[PDB]
Amino acid sequence: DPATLAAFSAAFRGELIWPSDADYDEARRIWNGTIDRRPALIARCTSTPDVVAAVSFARKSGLLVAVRGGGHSMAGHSVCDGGIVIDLSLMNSIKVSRRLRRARAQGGCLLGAFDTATQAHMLATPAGVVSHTGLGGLVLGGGFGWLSRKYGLSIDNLTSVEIVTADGGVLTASDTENPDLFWAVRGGGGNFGVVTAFEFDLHRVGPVRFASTYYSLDEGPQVIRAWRDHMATAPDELTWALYLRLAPPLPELPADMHGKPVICAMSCWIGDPHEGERQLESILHAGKPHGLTKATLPYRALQAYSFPGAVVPDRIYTKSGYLNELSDEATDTVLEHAADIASPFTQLELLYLGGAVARVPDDATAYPNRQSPFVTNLAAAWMDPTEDARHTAWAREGYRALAGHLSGGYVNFMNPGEADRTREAYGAAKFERLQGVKAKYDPTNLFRLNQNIPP
Ligand SMILES: Cc1cc2nc3c(=O)[nH]c(=O)nc-3n(C[C@H](O)[C@H](O)[C@H](O)COP(=O)(O)OP(=O)(O)OC[C@H]3O[C@@H](n4cnc5c(N)ncnc54)[C@H](O)[C@@H]3O)c2cc1C
Ligand SMILES: [Xe]
Ligand SMILES: [Xe]
């Protein structure tokens, strides 16, 4: 409708992307290549008022609203067929202060712009481990990475935000301003509106001692048992994750391990590197290590490596849950399952959290499952679309195969088929509180391309 559209055009100064344009096919592609959808309109916003006009417009037109930060939605939420995509990719600007250890990021930041900005002052705050992830979706659902055991979730360092709500108002939210929303936005998702600015606290982070190695799959049981019990008792400073995968063809690996299923191990000591050297060495021989790399890295460097691969995978499928305890039978399963991995980029990942995260009260934020120390992520990944059924199937026979030991799911790991699963991840009780807040700030469920919260 022209009256509605012309008003939008006048107030908006960000590039427009229409269904026809030469850049349409690229603008609508997201990282998750299995989602192939065609929106009515793509708005690459370049400022806060840009976003406001776009929020109202979609509402007055009855356009379904998709919000996209870095496009990594494993569930494919940041693109739609037949509606509007609010792309904040252009809002990528960042303010720092050495003298205030504070940063202000627009809602479309990629991690690597952010980490770059803070490490300019030898500063950092926890975020994910792969740098081109969008800051937006990551934080909205919670957000962890290397510093999380020491310093908590990204949301655990979040102070204020600027957010555009469905009714087109602009609000600041913090612990003292609309704390109901600030509570809800720390973990609920984009259900409540579009974050245009984020406020954090910053910590000083110098060179960190880091190690990755490749243990033979024969030694899988003892390493994980060692891994799980030791991490039960590991310093907050120690972070140690496991990636089970086909062995990369690296010259550091013996040819007889190339292309064979191995266990990788990535670890680091957030702290003095001298203490680190001692501590990592003590756990590196949980089994016989191969393709051993040790370095002292600026934290920026810790984020960049994730992850070495010569091909970027087009098609992905993920299945994730939490565990309170990993039994021996659980250990045998995953180990049992691994041998079946048949594509070079799919990983069954095993992360151990707790630390600063578990010392935070379960109801203190919208992030549920703090008390669950374990995360497992079954990440099918491949290229050839026709092969979809073979890999896609594997991860389920896995969550499904391993689906008891589990209690929940991380919202930022839901795949495109898990929209109904929104209730077990958050748990019941929390969700009732969330629905009250959504009903106050988004009574109409305008924002439904997320792990959706009905009003
Ligand atoms: C390869 C990979 C690695 C990852 N590693 C980690 C990790 O180490 N730690 C971790 O915690 N998570 C991790 N994640 C999860 C990550 O949070 C999700 O991929 C998430 O979808 C990425 O956010 P995004 O804004 O880039 O994606 P989007 O799809 O654009 O965002 C996902 C959801 O958030 C909404 N949203 C996004 N930005 C905004 C905004 N500014 N305002 C309002 N709503 C918004 C979207 O509409 C959608 O509802 C990883 C994901 C991938 C794919
Ligand atoms: Xe700031
Ligand atoms: Xe992944």
Q: What residue spans define the domains of the chain?
A: 14-92, 93-204+415-442, 205-414
The CA distance from 368 to 362, in Å, is: 6
The CA distance from 269 to 252, in Å, is: 23
Q: Fold identical between 93-204+415-442 and 205-414?
A: no
Q: Whose CA is closest to 198, among 238, 158, 169?
A: 158
111 neighbors 135 (Cβ within 8 angstroms): yes
List, in sequence order, every residue forming a beta bridge with 265; answer none if it has no partner: 213, 242
Eight-state DSSP code of residue 292: -
283 neighbors 267 (Cβ within 8 angstroms): yes
The CA distance from 163 to 173, in Å, is: 8
Name residue, tokens 């063809």.
249
The CA distance from 397 to 393, in Å, is: 7
For residue 71 and ligand 1, the question of a CB distance below 6 A is answered with yes
Q: Using alpha carbons only, how large is the chain's radius of gyration in Å?
A: 22
151 is in an annotated binding site: no
Q: Whose CA is closest to 334, among 414, 345, 343, 323?
A: 323
User: Three-class SS of residue 436?
Assistant: helix
Name residue, tokens 């496009």.
71
69 is in an annotated binding site: yes
The CA distance from 374 to 370, in Å, is: 10
List, in sequence order, every residue forming a beta bridge with 195; answer none if it has no partner: 163
Name residue, tokens 């702290």.
271
84 neighbors 40 (Cβ within 8 angstroms): yes
List, in sequence order, every residue forming a beta bridge with 293; answer none if it has no partner: 212
136 neighbors 69 (Cβ within 8 angstroms): yes
353 neighbors 375 (Cβ within 8 angstroms): yes
- Expt. technique: X-ray
List, in sequence order, every residue forming a beta bridge with 123; answer none if it has no partner: 204
The DSSP code sequence of 89-112 is TT---EEEEGGGTEEEEETT-BHH
40 neighbors 4 (Cβ within 8 angstroms): no
167 neighbors 219 (Cβ within 8 angstroms): no
List, in sequence order, every residue forming a beta bridge with 61; answer none if it has no partner: none
The DSSP code sequence of 356-415 is TTTTS-TTSSS---TT--EEEEEEEEES-GGGHHHHHHHHHHHHTTT-SSB----GGG--
For residue 107 and ligand 1, the question of a CB distance below 6 A is answered with yes
137 is in an annotated binding site: yes
CATH number of 205-414: 3.40.462.20
CA of 147 to the centre of ligand 1 (A): 18
Cβ-Cβ contacts under 8 Å for 402 (sequence gap 6 or more):
321, 330, 333, 334, 337, 376
412 is in an annotated binding site: yes
Sign for the CA dihedral angle at 143, 200, 195, 424 comes to positive
203 token code pair: 């910590």
Ligand having the closest approach to the CA of 190: 1
Residue 10's region, left for phi above 0, alpha for psi from -120 to 50, else beta, is alpha
Question: Hey, how many other C-beta atoms are within 10 angstroms of the C-beta on 148?
Answer: 27
255 token code pair: 């040819």
Fold of 93-204+415-442: 3.30.465
The CA distance from 364 to 53, in Å, is: 33
262 is in an annotated binding site: no
The CA distance from 373 to 406, in Å, is: 11
Ligand 1, atom 37, lies closest to the CA of: 137
347 token code pair: 């990983």
Name residue, tokens 């910053």.
202
321 neighbors 399 (Cβ within 8 angstroms): yes
Choose one of 48, 50, 68, 72 to mutate for the ligand 1 pocket test, by most ligand atoms within 8 angstroms of C-beta: 72
Cis peptide before 431 (omega within 30 of 0): no
Fold of 14-92: 3.30.43
The CA distance from 352 to 230, in Å, is: 11
User: Three-class SS of residue 242?
Assistant: strand
154 token code pair: 């990204």
Ligand having the closest approach to the CA of 96: 2
181 neighbors 268 (Cβ within 8 angstroms): no
Q: Whose CA is closest to 223, among 282, 288, 286, 291?
A: 286
φ, ψ dihedrals at 183, nearest 5°: -65, -45
As a residue count, the chain comes to 455
The CA distance from 136 to 91, in Å, is: 11
34 token code pair: 């299995």
Looking at 233-285, list the stretches that DSSP marks H as alpha helix, in order from N- to C-terminal side: 273-283
Residues lining ligand 2, judged by CB closer than 6 Å?
Answer: 95, 97, 100, 102, 104
361 neighbors 401 (Cβ within 8 angstroms): no
Q: This structure's resolution (angstroms)?
A: 3.7
CA of 411 to the centre of ligand 1 (A): 9
CA of 45 to the centre of ligand 3 (A): 28
User: What's the order of all strands across the beta sheet hosting 158-164?
Assistant: 94-97, 102-106, 194-201, 158-164, 170-173
